[PDB]
Amino acid sequence: YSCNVCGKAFVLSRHLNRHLRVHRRAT
Ligand SMILES: [Zn+2]
Numbered sequence: 001y002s003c004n005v006c007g008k009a010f011v012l013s014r015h016l017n018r019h020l021r022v023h024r025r026a027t
Contacts, residue, residue, distance in 0.1 A: 002009040005023040010016040
């Protein structure tokens with residue numbers, strides 16, 4: 001699993017989803 005927005009790889013999908021939420025921000 002990897003954050004498509006950057007390329008940061010994660011082992012767990014749940015962690016990646018949390019990381020995706022951070023990209024769903026404006027600032
Ligand atoms: Zn990311």
